[PDB]
């Protein structure tokens, strides 16, 4: 669409081994405002006839090294309607195969990880998984292991999503030779592990359980 | 615990061949003995006292029971750099392997300090400059003050 | 050459042939195959341990504390 | 000062995967105050000016600090 914001939805689970299942592509299953915007209609067997040369297909591998702990999971945002179809207490939000779309369960049900992209501008050709609140569809799991990775593939060129930790450095910086009474001096912490969003500025708030560490005196 | 390539960098899938074990690429040893966690069916030895080596380590607060428990991985620095890096931290205590000829390994009954023992890493090149299998290594010493 | 009771002894064994690993501090005396024993008339310590000064030096050292007798 | 200097502690997850805190400290000394009078001799109805150089009396960096005389 040259006038609108284009929305696409993908079934990307490359380890769903059910005989009936196939990686597939769908058009306008959602709006740019995260509304319904119509049904999901197969495009997998027609992409050859629509001038697709290895460039219309998204695949994802949540656990690349098969270590048992999945690195990447999926979550709802402002440009999609994702639902946890297995709501059993026995599973948690780290199970990417427990999410699906409720209205379209034949091909986008439990398992078959649905991934949604939205056009950044009516006629740009640049798509993303982030929404306007900077909440991505793809999130790293809380129990993910250092060194392990996932693999996201578009245009038959895969990219690794590597999990790693960063050494921190804290240093009090006195303005002059002595710290005397009634003088503010800066305290600076450098830890990449607290930068959990590259598109947002983050505070170490006590009240947020998802800030793992806070400096204390 | 059911494979000869336990607590080593490689693959659970494996075979026994002339040059050695096919699923082994790298491992770490203290005093020329595989650094492995006391788990499986052959970890029931208590040593001098009535405490098994596995619970003996746990009372000392050690979670780095072997190479597999530190989360050690080899990661390529770039997409096509050809250089792989891993890291981990030296523990205060470790549990020696009594017999390596059984699967699972048989572990000793008493923990030992790592101080005064050499540390080694062994890499097995499936293809050297001629396309033949060779093993190469490096060594270093653990010290105390 | 002569000691006193409750005095501290240092032992230096210079045995280069027991430098098994060049990057490990080697231990002698703790095994049935390679025992050591420090003894006085009446009492002894068996399977005592001596350790290498540095990793490839080949010198082994230890120390024992004499204690005397409780009835004096 | 020294071992009692205020220190901030930050628990940390390292790149080797082990949890190792990082910390910094800065000493908070006290200062010897001096008080002075601008002149050595005054005359009747002369302005007399008193100054106190004590850094420890600054309790706020944003506001001017004031001390007043007691009438009770």
From TrEMBL, chain D:
<protein>
    <submittedName>
        <fullName>Uncharacterized protein</fullName>
    </submittedName>
</protein>
